[PDB]
Nucleic acid binder design. Structure first.
Ligand code: NA
Ligand code: NA
Ligand code: NA
Ligand code: NA
Lengths: 166, 166
DNA sequence: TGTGGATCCGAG
DNA sequence: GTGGATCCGAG
């Protein structure tokens, strides 16, 4: 089982306003999870412009400390540009896999953003009703759909994608 | 006064075989100096392919230590990619202006070799009789013409230029 | 055959 | 506030 993690934040420096994962078993996506989170800092305007999550939405939510345990249960954590989420999240009990690094080894000379790959690779996932891009669970599905494409194409195991990831 | 310095070396790591310089005063090029130099090391064939200066040509020439002192006594020093000449030469007694950096700043999206600039700017200068690109005294005239044009176009001051260079 | 330096990229 | 990849100048 590979668990894709995505996160929304107050800015590039961190503070968590949302977290989500989907799990990947037998090349299928299952077991969606997502939580709005009460951050440790103001939500930057430039951040708010992106994910559209307001102070009002998170003010009654638990802290990242409180919420993270729900995401335990996985040897492997997959994140697009995993280095970000790795930094801004608290220490996870798995090992990491970055779908950005992998897509660059897999398909050199292309464009390497979550949404760029998804279009380029002409992919189609059953997306969650009612969330736009750069939300939380949405991008997980995009990233997962992209993880599947990547495994199918290369046949890479978990532990191979971990090592490549570095 | 601005002194344009150029150098032909044994390679990218150093080892002078030619120094040369010209001075810019009121947009005119004056006081040419040039010396074939005996390098502290073999002229790699890679470098020699460029400047076409043979071992024979420099066998009975002075060391760079007997010859640099002719080039001291200026407040400013101009070289194209100053950070090369600066590195391969003895500590020079002034302030440095790099025309490569000024060009990148003045004209973005362009190519930035001493000869690319010259052609792009369609500059015309009187180059010493029977020398050649990578001939030393030859590129000093080219770079002086570049400096001159940069100065016409930006109205930058010697001090402004150094600051830019960094 | 190396340096370095800029200069874009990814993540929000 | 930044770390990872490239590309480009000088001989
Ligand atoms: Na993300
Ligand atoms: Na996102
Ligand atoms: Na030079
Ligand atoms: Na030269």
């Amino acid at each position: 089982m590979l668990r894709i993690i995505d996160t929304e934040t107050c800015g590039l420096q961190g503070g968590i306003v949302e977290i989500a994962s989907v799990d990947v078993i037998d090349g299928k996506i299952v077991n969606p999870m997502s939580h709005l989170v009460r951050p440790d800092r103001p939500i930057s305007p430039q951040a708010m412009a992106i994910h559209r999550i307001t102070e009002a939405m998170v003010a009654d939510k638990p802290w990242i400390e409180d919420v993270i345990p729900h995401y335990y249960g996985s040897e492997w954590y997959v994140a697009h540009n995993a280095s970000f989420d790795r930094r801004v999240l608290p220490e996870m009990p798995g090992e990491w896999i970055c779908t950005m690094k992998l897509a660059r080894r897999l398909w050199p000379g292309i464009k390497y953003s979550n949404m760029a790959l998804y279009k380029t690779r002409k992919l189609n996932v059953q997306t969650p009703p009612g969330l736009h891009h750069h939300r939380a669970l949405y991008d997980c599905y995009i990233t997962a759909a992209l993880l599947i494409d990547i495994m199918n194409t290369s046949g890479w195991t978990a532990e191979q994608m971990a090592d490549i990831t570095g």
